[PDB]
Write a protein that binds this DNA or RNA. Structure first.
Ligand SMILES: Nc1ccn([C@H]2CC[C@@H](COP(=O)(O)OP(=O)(O)OP(=O)(O)O)O2)c(=O)n1
Ligand SMILES: [Mg+2]
Ligand code: NA
Length: 359
DNA sequence: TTTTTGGC
DNA sequence: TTTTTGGC
DNA sequence: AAAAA
């Protein structure tokens, strides 16, 4: 009867009846994330997450009874929204100069919290002043971010995601004809838009040297076709908390990870002119065939669903879950699974469909 | 930097 | 008061 | 921020 504090024990579809509340909570979490106050950031993210799962809109304070992740601070924000249809706390964040600058600077691909603070303390407030400054030096990633800014700020839609899927499939099958390409992330959860397109590549017949060289061969193929705009391996990046999977280094050694920017020609997109092409972010994961169920679960998301699955495993089941395996800490054995359903069953959880993982 | 919960 | 909040 | 201990 009671709503669980874990997102892995709730069904969260794209039907949100509480957008007025969750938009204000996302603004407050984002402000704390950009300022690195991680404890309170997560508390606002959890509060936003549970409200997204509600099958009715909050219309009175009596509706917050028996709902987890709602303390005195979150209750006062909800109360304030019930009163005038707006949050005075979220409105102050939207008018904050540090929030506005950080939000704008980190909207450029390759700009992390350290670079955005650096620019803010120099007195910069706009992207035109940053781009035209005579002394500033930029990384190759930041250069791609500025050169393809308008295409990246506009999001990828489902027709564009499927056209990129065709490019990935053609390239992969040239080197591994038996390879299976699965679209993961937000698009797997039924989202109609995304900041990127995510893929999981697996091959039953591939060898260790073949698995380790596939992403190298795929990106070289795109480079020869004139489709590669930017490329980097995750091993040489160092990402901020928002993009950190929090996995063991021996777990990550098992996979091959690559992130690109692809030139997507309009003639490849089947949907409802300009330069005739659009720059698209693509994230690629190569995983060993035997670890495919754990990798599909881990890269489907959402971020909130993943971290609560692991928190539940640790604190409720005395288990250890990651993107390659499930370990029972008490019995000292690994639990085998060939499907996402088998993983949920080992955890003692009712199976949650990917379209219900939008926590 | 806050409050809540649950055994001592 | 100190610890956890997705890994060891 | 909000638990947990
Ligand atoms: N800190 C993070 C970030 C990501 N992920 C996982 C789950 C989703 C997957 C792909 O990540 P994103 O592309 O960033 O997110 P998304 O769900 O696809 O959403 P969008 O691409 O639309 O921002 O990686 C995670 O476990 N923890
Ligand atoms: Mg994505
Ligand atoms: Na960024």
């Amino acid at each position: 009867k009671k709503i669980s504090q874990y997102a892995c024990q709730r069904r969260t579809t794209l039907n949100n009846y509480n957008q007025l509340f969750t938009d204000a909570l996302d603004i407050l979490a984002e402000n704390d994330e950009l300022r690195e106050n991680e404890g309170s950031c997560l508390a606002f993210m959890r509060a936003s997450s549970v409200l997204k799962s509600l099958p009715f809109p909050i219309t009175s304070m009596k509706d917050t009874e028996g709902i987890p992740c709602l303390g005195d601070k979150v209750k006062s924000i909800i109360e304030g929204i019930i009163e005038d249809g707006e949050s005075s706390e979220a409105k102050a964040v939207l008018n904050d100069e540090r929030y506005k600058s950080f939000k704008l600077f980190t909207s450029v691909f390759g700009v992390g919290l350290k670079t955005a603070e650096k620019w803010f303390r120099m007195g910069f407030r706009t992207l035109s002043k940053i781009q035209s400054d005579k002394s500033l030096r930029f990384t190759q990633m930041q250069k791609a971010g500025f050169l393809y800014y308008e295409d990246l700020v506009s999001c990828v839609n489902r027709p564009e995601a499927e056209a990129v899927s065709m490019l990935v499939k053609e390239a992969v099958v040239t080197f591994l004809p038996d390879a299976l390409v699965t679209m993961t992330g937000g698009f797997r959860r039924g989202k109609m838009t995304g900041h990127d397109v995510d893929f999981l590549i697996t091959s039953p017949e591939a060898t260790e040297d073949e698995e380790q060289q596939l992403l190298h061969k795929v990106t070289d193929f795109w480079k020869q076709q004139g489709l590669l705009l930017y490329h980097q391996y995750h091993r040489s990046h160092l990402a901020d908390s928002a993009h950190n999977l929090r996995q063991r280094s021996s777990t990550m050694d098992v996979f091959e990870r690559s992130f690109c920017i692809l030139k997507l020609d309009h003639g490849r997109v089947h949907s409802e002119e300009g330069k005739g092409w659009k720059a698209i972010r693509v994230d690629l994961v190569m995983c060993p065939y035997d670890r495919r169920a754990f990798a599909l679960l881990g890269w489907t998301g959402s971020r909130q669903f993943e971290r609560d699955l692991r928190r539940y495993a640790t604190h409720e089941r005395k288990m250890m879950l990651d993107n390659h395996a499930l370990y029972d800490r008490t019995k000292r054995v690994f639990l085998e699974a060939e499907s996402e359903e088998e993983i949920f069953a080992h955890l003692g959880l009712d199976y949650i469909e990917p379209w219900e993982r939008n926590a």
